[PDB]
Design a protein around this nucleic acid. Structure first.
Ligand SMILES: Nc1nc2c(ncn2[C@H]2C[C@H](O)[C@@H](COP(=O)(O)NP(=O)(O)OP(=O)(O)O)O2)c(=O)[nH]1
Ligand SMILES: [Mg+2]
Ligand SMILES: [Mg+2]
Ligand SMILES: [Mn+2]
Ligand SMILES: [Mn+2]
Length: 539
DNA sequence: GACCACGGCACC
DNA sequence: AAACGGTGCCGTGGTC
């Protein structure tokens, strides 16, 4: 384009270069804009931010987050990435979008601004006529990007000193386990090397090899195969404990406290909006959507996430979300009655697993039951279900058969979805979000059936993500007016931060908004708790 | 230093 | 590991 003097006119498309992918940590190297056949390159990008009223262009949210970091209210506007992601959720990166819709993603702000303009015009034209996708764009994704920008810039408080001390305790427990392993193996070696561990367990020792690795065909040392040998040898027990502790230490305990931002004093993730095939968000740098919780040690890690002084965390989580969605999508009256009668299928399944009754189930049992219910639903095999549960193969067959028989209309909806998927090439959510699944007609059974599992899972998981996103859109302005903050989303859950004097009203308000986000043939129920830390707020 | 593949595993 | 789905990060082992 023709070079034009900064500032650009309103509504121009922006381009920007960051020193690193994380907006909260990045140095803004260059800033440019393009409109009306002109290009505008900023002489000093930081000062030039003040001239923009809106971040409109590729990766708009990132720039908006960096602006909020600098105290500037620069909301994100149109982003061609959001248009492409709605056209096809395999559009996940600017490189691929440009290579697909006519452009080149470079490292120069001016070119990124010019690309943003062309790509918007092209993708906008491609969506001309996709009424449902346009609705998702205007009413969910585009306003959501603003919500996520505020969440990313706000961050979450972390009890660093607590995690530092925990790192030292866990270290001593790791050393003891390592010593028991070396002594049992008769020599030292790198316990973190699965290749070296393979030799010890299966060659040196005579333990049988349950399974192989996918790509290289090596004897697997995964927990699933080692769990089979939890009695066939004692060193296996200690190795599983060693991995558990090193996993949590190396992934969470040690890195997280080193990511506190100097200006905010809090921990800042990134909520990626075009990263999944089903419409879910993802979290990275660091991923705060997979903080441990299953084990007592993992719960100790959760307690590190705390509220600012004078505030309280509010945790809200949808109940049996994808099962309620399946009720609406399929119409199985039996399944609708379950929820219109207040029954809990996770608890009910936990009863048959552990042979204990209703009131006896604790969270640990119910978690196990939750994996079973969704495992069976989305196509787990009797052989694997026999592996888990530790019941005979026939006993796993009967459970899967009774599971689907309890809700007869579910299996019928699956086939309608696949038929439509085969005919149409894609499956869609309740709101029309699409995922393309061409392999539904592949000639290799394994490939075809794998694609089938992906196909009929997407409308359920995708609808749940749609509902959550829409709830965040509706809830955010209500939180601001009450002086509350939205901190985290974990697919079917939100963590808010509210002043102590308002935490109660915020919790009630957020519960109502999430439950009424979009009435279905089944009621949506939300569980809510308040506490000083993430764990106590969710229990 | 920068990338990357792989096995492995944490979250919903 | 295996006919659950969706993610991202770890250390290892390797290349340039
Ligand atoms: N396929 C699959 N989906 C899963 C799994 N775990 C979770 N999901 C999906 C399906 C779940 O509906 C959704 C939310 O997960 P939660 O909040 O941890 N559990 P829920 O909402 O079911 O029940 P409650 O909140 O009353 O304990 O994530 C899994 O192992 N597999
Ligand atoms: Mg991988
Ligand atoms: Mg899986
Ligand atoms: Mn839930
Ligand atoms: Mn949840």
């Amino acid at each position: 384009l023709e070079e034009a003097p900064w500032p650009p006119p309103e509504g121009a498309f922006v381009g920007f270069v960051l020193s690193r992918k994380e907006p909260m940590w990045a140095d803004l190297l260059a800033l440019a804009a393009a409109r009306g056949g002109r290009v505008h390159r900023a002489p000093e990008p930081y000062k030039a931010l003040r001239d923009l009223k809106e971040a409109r262009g590729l990766l708009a949210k990132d720039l908006s987050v960096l602006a909020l970091r600098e105290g500037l209210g620069l909301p994100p506007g149109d982003d061609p990435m959001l248009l492409a992601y709605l056209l096809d959720p395999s559009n996940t990166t600017p490189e691929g979008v440009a290579r697909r819709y006519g452009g080149e993603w470079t490292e120069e702000a001016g070119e990124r601004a010019a690309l943003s303009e062309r790509l918007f015009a092209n993708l906008w034209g491609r969506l001309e006529g996709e009424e449902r996708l346009l609705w998702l764009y205007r009413e969910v994704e585009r306003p959501l990007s603003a919500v996520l920008a505020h969440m990313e810039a706000t961050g979450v408080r972390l009890d660093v000193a607590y995690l530092r001390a925990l790192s030292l305790e866990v270290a001593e427990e790791i050393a003891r386990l390592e010593a028991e392993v070396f002594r049992l193996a008769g020599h030292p070696f790198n316990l973190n090397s699965r290749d070296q561990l393979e030799r010890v367990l299966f060659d040196e020792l005579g333990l049988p090899a349950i399974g192989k690795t996918e790509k290289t065909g090596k004897r697997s040392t995964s927990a699933a195969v080692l769990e089979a040998l939890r009695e066939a040898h004692p060193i296996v027990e200690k190795i599983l404990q060693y991995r558990e502790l090193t996993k949590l230490k190396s992934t969470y305990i040690d890195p997280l406290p080193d990511l506190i931002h100097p200006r905010t004093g809090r921990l800042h993730t990134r909520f990626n909006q075009t990263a999944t095939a089903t419409g879910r968000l993802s979290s990275s740098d660091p991923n705060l959507q997979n903080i441990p919780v299953r084990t007592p040690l993992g719960q100790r890690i959760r307690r590190a996430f705390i509220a600012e002084e004078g505030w309280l965390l509010v945790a809200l989580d949808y109940s049996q979300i994808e099962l309620r969605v399946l009720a609406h999508l399929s119409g199985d009256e039996n399944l609708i009655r379950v929820f219109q009668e207040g029954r809990d299928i996770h608890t009910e399944t936990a009863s048959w697993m552990f042979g204990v009754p209703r009131e006896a189930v604790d969270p640990l049992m119910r978690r196990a039951a939750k994996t079973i219910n969704f495992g069976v639903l989305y196509g787990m095999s009797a052989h694997r279900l026999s592996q888990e549960l530790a019941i005979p193969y026939e006993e796993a067959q009967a459970f899967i058969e009774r599971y689907f028989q309890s809700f007869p209309k579910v299996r019928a909806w699956i086939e309608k979805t696949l038929e439509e998927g085969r005919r149409r090439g894609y499956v869609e959510t309740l709101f029309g979000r699409r995922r393309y699944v061409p392999d539904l007609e592949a000639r290799v059974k394994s490939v075809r059936e794998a694609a089938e599992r992906m196909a009929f899972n997407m409308p359920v998981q995708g609808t749940a993500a749609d509902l959550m996103k829409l709830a965040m859109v509706k809830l955010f302005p209500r939180l601001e007016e009450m002086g509350a903050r939205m901190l985290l989303q974990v697919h079917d859950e939100l963590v808010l931060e509210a002043p102590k004097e308002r935490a109660e009203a915020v919790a009630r308000l957020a519960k109502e908004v999430m439950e009424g986000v979009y009435p279905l043939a089944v009621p949506l129920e939300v569980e809510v708790g308040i506490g000083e830390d993430w764990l106590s707020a969710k229990e």
